[PDB]
Write a protein that binds this ligand. Structure first.
Ligand SMILES: Cc1cc2nc3c(=O)[nH]c(=O)nc-3n(C[C@H](O)[C@H](O)[C@H](O)COP(=O)(O)OP(=O)(O)OC[C@H]3O[C@@H](n4cnc5c(N)ncnc54)[C@H](O)[C@@H]3O)c2cc1C
Ligand SMILES: NC(=O)c1cccnc1
Ligand SMILES: [Mg+2]
Length: 309
């Protein structure tokens, strides 16, 4: 059944924490673990990082932590590096169910010369490689938390939540779904529908697949899960199978859920959105609806939640 989590006083706050720690005086947290989430055929490396904040940097699901990687700011001699934000992939109780850790889902940003494929360490992403290279006991300069766009609307515990992720965009949804299904949170008993769509490059690039598949078996009447593997699947038109093509497969169900008040969430890199918008426009047109008008209504009704970069 549901996992006991502590301390329940984390449910008492009525507002999310924001900017508890700031860049000039970050919280020095400690790495608990770092593990690759992906198999050898994955085009890139994505890691799961567990960080001990000791209960000093609590957060709500959907927020981000800032990390200040070591070194001097290249564009600002004598200054610390700029904060990089990472979507927290854990619930407020964390992966140890104790309110002392938070987790990140971090894609290594690696540079390859577009012609030769060669590498250059001065051009890899600083913070993503810093994090995925970390080992237990390493210290991390933590700031935040920050962000409110992806806070989970809990007013209606029987709401519908349609979660659209590419790659590390799955992070907030791992936290949402643990809160909805895994953890014993007496003041939030989810009885709605949560529907996760995840687009990645191939099967080896899947993130947390075992956890999500387990929810299908534990909460079959409350959870749905669809995956789009761009390099291993092709869409109805011959294009690579992107998450928007999976959305299109369920277009009638999704549009009806939206009309009924479902929340819809988009998270990941911003390049995911143009194809999604194109598909939604096409779906709307086939149904005889204006996607522009529908989207305006979804935004007005606070059903549309996008955090991409
Ligand atoms: C709200 C928010 C949440 C986020 N959540 C996540 C998350 O959960 N997971 C995640 O992985 N990311 C997330 N990101 C992105 C993350 O913040 C970083 O931007 C990302 O990790 C890259 O940072 P970095 O320090 O590794 O790369 P940087 O050092 O900032 O470099 C940026 C890019 O420039 C490239 N580059 C550097 N020098 C050169 C050069 N000379 N020529 C060509 N290219 C170069 C790097 O390879 C890299 O791709 C989020 C962003 C935001 C705004
Ligand atoms: N988790 C992510 O990949 C993410 C979230 C928000 C902005 N950019 C990237
Ligand atoms: Mg795998």
């Amino acid at each position: 059944s549901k996992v006991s989590v502590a301390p329940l006083h984390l449910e008492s706050a009525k507002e999310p924490p924001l900017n508890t720690y700031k860049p000039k005086e970050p919280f020095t947290a400690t790495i608990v673990s770092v593990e690759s989430l992906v198999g050898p055929k994955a085009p890139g490396e994505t890691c799961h990082i567990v960080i001990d904040h000791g209960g000093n940097v609590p957060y709500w699901e959907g927020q981000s932590y800032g990390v200040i990687p070591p070194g001097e700011n290249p564009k600002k001699p004598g200054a610390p590096q700029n904060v990089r934000l990472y979507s927290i992939a854990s619930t407020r109780y964390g992966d140890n169910f104790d309110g002392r850790t938070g987790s990140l889902c971090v894609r290594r940003a690696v540079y390859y010369d577009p012609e030769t494929g060669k590498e250059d360490p001065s051009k890899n992403g600083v913070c993503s490689n810093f994090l995925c290279n970390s080992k237990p006991g390493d210290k991390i300069q933590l700031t935040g938390p920050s962000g409110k766009i992806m806070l989970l609307p809990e007013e209606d515990p029987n709401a519908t939540h349609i979660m659209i992720a590419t790659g590390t965009g799955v992070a907030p949804f791992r936290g949402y779904l643990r809160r909805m299904f895994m953890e014993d949170v007496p003041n939030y008993r989810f009885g709605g529908l949560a529907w996760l769509f995840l687009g990645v490059a191939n099967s080896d690039s899947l993130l947390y697949d075992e956890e999500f598949t387990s929810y299908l078996k534990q909460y079959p009447d409350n959870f749905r899960y669809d995956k789009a593997l761009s390099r291993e699947q092709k869409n109805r038109s011959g294009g690579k199978m992107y998450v928007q093509d999976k959305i299109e497969e369920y277009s009638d169900e999704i549009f009806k859920l939206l009309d009924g008040g479902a929340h819809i969430y988009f998270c990941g890199l911003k390049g995911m959105m143009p194809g999604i918008q194109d598909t939604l426009k096409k779906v709307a047109e086939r149904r005889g609806e204006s996607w522009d008008q529908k989207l305006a209504q979804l935004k007005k009704n606070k059903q549309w939640h996008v955090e991409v970069s």
